[PDB]
Design an enzyme around this catalytic site. Structure first.
Site, PDB file in Angstrom:
ATOM      1  NE  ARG A  87       2.361   0.720   3.534  1.00 16.53           N
ATOM      2  CZ  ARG A  87       3.472   0.013   3.672  1.00 16.53           C
ATOM      3  NH1 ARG A  87       3.734  -0.603   4.831  1.00 16.53           N
ATOM      4  NH2 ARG A  87       4.330  -0.074   2.655  1.00 16.53           N
ATOM      5  CD  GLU A 110      -5.467   2.510  -7.041  1.00 20.88           C
ATOM      6  OE1 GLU A 110      -5.860   1.379  -6.682  1.00 20.88           O
ATOM      7  OE2 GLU A 110      -5.627   3.544  -6.366  1.00 20.88           O
ATOM      8  CD1 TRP A 154      -7.114   9.336  -2.159  1.00 25.11           C
ATOM      9  CD2 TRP A 154      -8.259   9.405  -0.222  1.00 25.11           C
ATOM     10  NE1 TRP A 154      -6.265   9.847  -1.182  1.00 25.11           N
ATOM     11  CE2 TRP A 154      -6.945   9.891   0.011  1.00 25.11           C
ATOM     12  CE3 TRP A 154      -9.166   9.344   0.855  1.00 25.11           C
ATOM     13  CZ2 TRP A 154      -6.520  10.341   1.272  1.00 25.11           C
ATOM     14  CZ3 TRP A 154      -8.740   9.804   2.126  1.00 25.11           C
ATOM     15  CH2 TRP A 154      -7.422  10.291   2.308  1.00 25.11           C
ATOM     16  CB  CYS A 163      -1.036   0.033   1.156  1.00 25.10           C
ATOM     17  SG  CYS A 163      -2.040   1.540   1.084  1.00 25.10           S
TER      18      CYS A 163
HETATM   19  C1  HEM Z   1      -6.549   6.439   1.491  1.00 29.50           C
HETATM   20  C2  HEM Z   1      -6.134   6.312   0.225  1.00 29.50           C
HETATM   21  C3  HEM Z   1      -5.415   5.047  -0.322  1.00 29.50           C
HETATM   22  C4  HEM Z   1      -4.663   5.030  -1.440  1.00 29.50           C
HETATM   23  C5  HEM Z   1      -4.337   6.219  -2.387  1.00 29.50           C
HETATM   24  C6  HEM Z   1      -4.148   3.687  -1.614  1.00 29.50           C
HETATM   25  C7  HEM Z   1      -3.358   3.265  -2.668  1.00 29.50           C
HETATM   26  C8  HEM Z   1      -3.154   1.924  -2.971  1.00 29.50           C
HETATM   27  C9  HEM Z   1      -2.691   1.375  -4.238  1.00 29.50           C
HETATM   28  C10 HEM Z   1      -2.363   2.209  -5.496  1.00 29.50           C
HETATM   29  C11 HEM Z   1      -2.579   0.047  -4.106  1.00 29.50           C
HETATM   30  C12 HEM Z   1      -2.102  -0.961  -5.181  1.00 29.50           C
HETATM   31  C13 HEM Z   1      -3.008  -0.962  -6.414  1.00 29.50           C
HETATM   32  C14 HEM Z   1      -2.205  -1.290  -7.662  1.00 29.50           C
HETATM   33  O1  HEM Z   1      -0.964  -1.559  -7.581  1.00 29.50           O
HETATM   34  O2  HEM Z   1      -2.815  -1.288  -8.774  1.00 29.50           O
HETATM   35  C15 HEM Z   1      -2.984  -0.292  -2.750  1.00 29.50           C
HETATM   36  C16 HEM Z   1      -3.006  -1.566  -2.206  1.00 29.50           C
HETATM   37  C17 HEM Z   1      -3.482  -1.937  -0.975  1.00 29.50           C
HETATM   38  N1  HEM Z   1      -3.932  -1.088   0.052  1.00 29.50           N
HETATM   39 FE1  HEM Z   1      -4.124   0.951  -0.181  1.00 29.50          FE
HETATM   40  N2  HEM Z   1      -4.581   2.924  -0.548  1.00 29.50           N
HETATM   41  C18 HEM Z   1      -5.420   3.694   0.237  1.00 29.50           C
HETATM   42  C19 HEM Z   1      -6.129   3.258   1.366  1.00 29.50           C
HETATM   43  C20 HEM Z   1      -6.136   1.997   1.919  1.00 29.50           C
HETATM   44  C21 HEM Z   1      -6.918   1.560   3.071  1.00 29.50           C
HETATM   45  C22 HEM Z   1      -7.988   2.406   3.808  1.00 29.50           C
HETATM   46  C23 HEM Z   1      -6.561   0.304   3.333  1.00 29.50           C
HETATM   47  C24 HEM Z   1      -7.091  -0.642   4.443  1.00 29.50           C
HETATM   48  C25 HEM Z   1      -7.591  -0.171   5.597  1.00 29.50           C
HETATM   49  C26 HEM Z   1      -5.563  -0.096   2.374  1.00 29.50           C
HETATM   50  C27 HEM Z   1      -4.915  -1.323   2.300  1.00 29.50           C
HETATM   51  C28 HEM Z   1      -4.345  -1.826   1.148  1.00 29.50           C
HETATM   52  C29 HEM Z   1      -4.035  -3.223   0.904  1.00 29.50           C
HETATM   53  C30 HEM Z   1      -4.263  -4.417   1.870  1.00 29.50           C
HETATM   54  C31 HEM Z   1      -3.464  -3.309  -0.483  1.00 29.50           C
HETATM   55  C32 HEM Z   1      -3.016  -4.601  -1.230  1.00 29.50           C
HETATM   56  C33 HEM Z   1      -4.334  -5.089  -1.893  1.00 29.50           C
HETATM   57  C34 HEM Z   1      -4.258  -6.466  -2.522  1.00 29.50           C
HETATM   58  O3  HEM Z   1      -3.367  -7.289  -2.163  1.00 29.50           O
HETATM   59  O4  HEM Z   1      -5.126  -6.774  -3.404  1.00 29.50           O
HETATM   60  N3  HEM Z   1      -5.279   0.965   1.561  1.00 29.50           N
HETATM   61  N4  HEM Z   1      -3.284   0.885  -2.059  1.00 29.50           N
HETATM   62  C1  LIG Z   2      -8.349   0.383  -0.241  1.00 29.73           C
HETATM   63  C2  LIG Z   2      -7.690   0.602  -1.593  1.00 29.73           C
HETATM   64  C3  LIG Z   2      -7.558   1.896  -2.095  1.00 29.73           C
HETATM   65  C4  LIG Z   2      -6.925   2.068  -3.342  1.00 29.73           C
HETATM   66  N1  LIG Z   2      -6.777   3.302  -3.900  1.00 29.73           N
HETATM   67  N2  LIG Z   2      -6.507   0.997  -4.055  1.00 29.73           N
HETATM   68  C5  LIG Z   2      -6.604  -0.272  -3.585  1.00 29.73           C
HETATM   69  C6  LIG Z   2      -6.110  -1.426  -4.446  1.00 29.73           C
HETATM   70  C7  LIG Z   2      -7.335  -2.276  -4.801  1.00 29.73           C
HETATM   71  C8  LIG Z   2      -7.103  -3.253  -5.938  1.00 29.73           C
HETATM   72  C9  LIG Z   2      -7.690  -3.011  -7.184  1.00 29.73           C
HETATM   73  N3  LIG Z   2      -7.520  -3.856  -8.231  1.00 29.73           N
HETATM   74  C10 LIG Z   2      -6.770  -4.957  -8.114  1.00 29.73           C
HETATM   75  C11 LIG Z   2      -6.167  -5.264  -6.898  1.00 29.73           C
HETATM   76  C12 LIG Z   2      -5.339  -6.532  -6.799  1.00 29.73           C
HETATM   77  C13 LIG Z   2      -6.283  -7.696  -6.464  1.00 29.73           C
HETATM   78  C14 LIG Z   2      -5.452  -8.916  -6.126  1.00 29.73           C
HETATM   79  C15 LIG Z   2      -5.384 -10.029  -6.965  1.00 29.73           C
HETATM   80  C16 LIG Z   2      -4.591 -11.123  -6.576  1.00 29.73           C
HETATM   81  C17 LIG Z   2      -4.489 -12.347  -7.466  1.00 29.73           C
HETATM   82  N4  LIG Z   2      -3.913 -11.091  -5.396  1.00 29.73           N
HETATM   83  C18 LIG Z   2      -3.980  -9.990  -4.570  1.00 29.73           C
HETATM   84  N5  LIG Z   2      -3.309  -9.934  -3.394  1.00 29.73           N
HETATM   85  C19 LIG Z   2      -4.761  -8.909  -4.930  1.00 29.73           C
HETATM   86  C20 LIG Z   2      -6.334  -4.412  -5.784  1.00 29.73           C
HETATM   87  C21 LIG Z   2      -7.223  -0.499  -2.347  1.00 29.73           C
END
Ligand code: HEM
Ligand SMILES: Cc1cc(N)nc(CCc2cncc(CCc3cc(C)nc(N)c3)c2)c1
Ligand code: HEM
Ligand SMILES: Cc1cc(N)nc(CCc2cncc(CCc3cc(C)nc(N)c3)c2)c1
Ligand SMILES: Cc1cc(N)nc(CCc2cncc(CCc3cc(C)nc(N)c3)c2)c1
Ligand SMILES: Cc1cc(N)nc(CCc2cncc(CCc3cc(C)nc(N)c3)c2)c1
Ligand SMILES: [Cl-]
Ligand SMILES: [Cl-]
Ligand SMILES: [Zn+2]
Ligand SMILES: [Zn+2]
Ligand SMILES: [Zn+2]
Lengths: 407, 411
Positions: B111, B285, B280, B108
């Site tokens: 953070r 993305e 957000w 993330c």
């Molecule tokens: C507040 C604004 C936030 C922004 C701008 C943001 C941004 C991102 C981005 C860009 C990714 C990866 C997506 C990609 O590589 O295509 C990500 C992944 C992730 N974020 Fe955030 N994030 C935010 C909030 C949060 C919140 C509120 C949480 C949980 C409470 C969170 C937990 C995670 C987790 C667990 C992942 C990995 C997801 C997965 O494995 O599929 N994030 N974040």
């Molecule tokens: C809370 C939050 C905010 C934000 N701006 N972006 C995200 C990323 C969400 C997101 C969107 N599309 C694709 C993925 C990856 C899904 C994904 C797929 C596989 C195979 N393994 C994983 N660990 C995760 C994550 C999460």
């Protein structure tokens, strides 16, 4: 251990078995991944020689043959007697090609079997090293139709008689700290430039001064030599649409040639082994021109483009980046100097990787380096899972010799 | 032990001690790095050390380590586990746990915001209808008419693994995809499988390019049930470009709220299998991943055609040019509609400030370079030349398989 790698765009799954032959260590553990860290006797020598000779004899379909056993016998005897051994020309060529094949950070490996190997093991002096290097530069350059090559100087003996090229690349530009406090030229090369001047180089003190070679033969203090200017092919950078781009006064050299790495074959160590290919465009247009610690030209270009530079969200940096990379490719192509764009290069690597899985059982690859420094996800390597591991023969980083040499 | 990381642009060096607290494994070994591999019922015995590790962490953070209250809580949890085979978290511990799972999420880039997270406690929920109401309330709160607020809703924890709460959707808001007889796809190709499941369960599909999927919700291990999110709660942004007036006629739009609903939250050994969370968007993305991945909306060609770019050779960098303009459009559109969004330069600059602060105050910041670096213009962001260390801290968010592969259908 069969390991699967998936491509997330195509859903295609490949199975890696080659990692089971890996020898060197990664720096990772079960607790911590160091994937993004840049730098993570007779007794020892015979197992390394055997491992190599076994792979060599297997490659020419002669494993377990009399010639195989006889060569193993011959090398064993030579090590016991002399504490080292000499490679046959066939073994040297095979080893150098496989060091490239095994280079997990190299996107250009589809080309690995077409490497011209120059055997410079008969070289004894720094002047001899200079002649060999000029000949490599002329051969590889080939009036703009670049050819991959490596020149291999004598192997390490007791470690007190190392051959070394002190330069990090055969062709690279000088950097100079200014009274002003800024840097003129390439900031990457400030320390090496100083050593050159200290050793007697008469510096032109300009933005694109080709550095002299500092060559170390037989563990002796290095000596300075200038590459004949007419052997250093350079390209002036212009843009197909923006007439003003030429006014930035930018140029680059055509030949990318790494000179600071160590080639390990069959436990033997070649500490001077300069090698060269041709450029991927982003290497010049993204890395060399736009890194903040390098020529750092983004702001000047954006200004000339009259972009809104007040806010990052206008994506002015991204716009200027693309135009700089367009100009690099256009200029090299217009002057008929080999270059590959990042789309073409990554497509080729994926094809290479598929070939390697089917014919070899895998292809070690470092995603952090294989993915281009711009437009990553629109290239076919981004969504490709990769496994990184170390096979020998190999190219290894070695520290800058001025930190090690005793004058 | 000490591990050092370097920044190759600034030469700044930082020292990690926090890695000593890592428990779980990475997938890597001394012989092989799995850094680019995307996917590399507990007993009483294993549960109490996990509970104790968590409670020690919690009480240290409130400066009450070794206090009567700390010792009393350890005893209370011990007795609860021995008697009931599990335990319940106090509301304070739940909040702390959810915030720390986010703080610990190595993939993330957002953070810097981790301590600002609204936690909705839904552990009293018993039915799919109940889940639906909690989820609507989350969407409305988080959306806040475009002034997005980070939030998580936490449903009851796993018991025997036969009574799990799950949100079957991968994200709370996402668009349907439909495979056509000719092999083309209408809508979002990422969601074809889930869309078929929804239709089979009784959803009447509009069959357009941007149809908001229904929620498919599973309470207490029962078969999941379908609910439509009220359309007035789903904020969307039509995409236009500041200079190119034809961009709007591509007919593009996207939703404002990114909300992950398929992950598992682990706190003190307890497993929360339904824990939707939202923040957000970072612009890439939408503009890079969702619009330009070949397996998604795949719009690069159409955009480049309308720009009249030279598409005969890749060396004209037409794809790169079109990609920048699409991403300009996304940021412009959200900003014009006053919907929270962050560009990749701002987000990565903020992440580096966050990371350096974490090294100083916490002794480290685990981070996955592969995910942290944006999918365009990587090296001109301050994360590209930053060395990172990836390791697993708990509390944590974990991947779990899609529930349609594992669910026992009751009928
Ligand atoms: C507040 C604004 C936030 C922004 C701008 C943001 C941004 C991102 C981005 C860009 C990714 C990866 C997506 C990609 O590589 O295509 C990500 C992944 C992730 N974020 Fe955030 N994030 C935010 C909030 C949060 C919140 C509120 C949480 C949980 C409470 C969170 C937990 C995670 C987790 C667990 C992942 C990995 C997801 C997965 O494995 O599929 N994030 N974040
Ligand atoms: C809370 C939050 C905010 C934000 N701006 N972006 C995200 C990323 C969400 C997101 C969107 N599309 C694709 C993925 C990856 C899904 C994904 C797929 C596989 C195979 N393994 C994983 N660990 C995760 C994550 C999460
Ligand atoms: C023929 C055209 C070639 C192309 C297009 C090419 C491409 C590249 C690129 C783009 C990189 C990384 C640069 C970066 O990420 O900034 C690289 C690294 C590397 N390549 Fe190649 N390569 C070529 C030929 C060669 C040859 C001939 C050899 C050796 C015989 C070689 C061995 C290596 C090694 C060892 C690295 C890692 C270097 C380091 O650690 O500093 N490559 N290659
Ligand atoms: C033969 C060849 C062809 C080509 N097209 N590119 C290359 C890349 C050369 C190159 C240029 N600039 C920088 C580097 C990285 C130098 C480098 C620096 C450190 C600290 N560790 C390393 N292992 C390597 C490599 C080599
Ligand atoms: C993370 C990464 C990704 C990628 N695609 N290529 C590389 C290698 C090429 C590269 C690019 N930019 C910067 C560097 C570092 C150059 C560098 C080398 C030395 C010796 N000292 C420094 N302070 C800096 C190397 C690294
Ligand atoms: C390598 C990588 C880099 C990065 N910056 N972000 C991510 C995570 C987001 C992401 C982007 N594009 C594609 C995916 C995979 C989505 C995906 C998910 C599933 C379940 N099946 C598929 N065939 C594909 C994830 C991955
Ligand atoms: Cl770079
Ligand atoms: Cl992506
Ligand atoms: Zn760089
Ligand atoms: Zn690793
Ligand atoms: Zn993608």
């Amino acid at each position: 251990r069969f390991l699967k790698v998936k491509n997330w765009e195509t859903d295609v799954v490949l199975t890696d078995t080659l990692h089971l032959k890996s020898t060197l260590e990664t720096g990772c553990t079960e607790h911590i991944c160091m994937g993004s860290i840049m730098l993570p006797t007779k007794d020892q020598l015979f197992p390394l020689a055997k491992e190599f000779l076994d792979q060599y004899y297997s490659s020419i379909k002669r494993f377990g043959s009399k010639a195989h056993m006889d060569r193993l016998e011959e090398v064993n005897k030579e090590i016991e007697s002399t504490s080292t051994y000499q490679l046959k020309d066939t073994e040297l060529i095979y080893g150098a090609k496989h060091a490239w094949r095994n280079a997990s950070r190299c996107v250009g490996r589809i080309q690995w079997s077409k490497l011209q190997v120059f055997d410079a093991r008969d070289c004894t002096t720094a002047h001899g090293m200079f002649n060999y290097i000029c000949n490599h530069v002329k051969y590889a350059t080939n009036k703009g139709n670049l050819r991959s090559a490596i020149t291999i100087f004598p192997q390490r003996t007791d470690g007190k008689h190392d051959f070394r090229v002190w330069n990090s690349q055969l062709i690279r530009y000088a950097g100079y700290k200014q009274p002003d406090g800024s840097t003129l030229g390439d900031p990457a090369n400030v320390q090496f430039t100083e050593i050159c001047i200290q050793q007697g180089w008469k510096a032109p003190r300009g933005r694109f001064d080709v550095l002299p070679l500092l060559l170390q033969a037989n563990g002796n203090d290095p000596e300075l030599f200038q590459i004949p200017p007419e052997l250093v092919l350079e390209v002036p950078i212009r843009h197909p649409k923006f007439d003003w781009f030429k006014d930035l006064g930018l140029k680059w050299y055509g030949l990318p040639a790494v000179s600071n790495m160590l080639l390990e074959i069959g436990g033997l160590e070649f500490s001077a082994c300069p090698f060269s290919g041709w450029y991927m465009g982003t290497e010049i247009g993204v890395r060399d021109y736009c890194d903040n610690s390098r020529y750092n030209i983004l702001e000047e270009v954006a200004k000339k483009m009259d972009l809104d530079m007040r806010k990052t969200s206008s994506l002015w940096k991204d716009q200027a980046l693309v135009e700089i990379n367009i100009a690099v490719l256009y200029s090299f192509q217009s002057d008929k100097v080999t270059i590959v764009d990042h789309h073409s290069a990554t497509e080729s690597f994926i094809k290479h990787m598929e070939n390697e899985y089917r014919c070899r059982g895998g292809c070690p690859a470092d995603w952090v380096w294989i993915v281009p420094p711009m437009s990553g996800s629109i290239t076919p390597v981004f969504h490709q899972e990769m496994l990184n591991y170390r096979l020998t023969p190999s190219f290894e980083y070695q520290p800058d010799p001025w930190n090690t040499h005793v004058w």
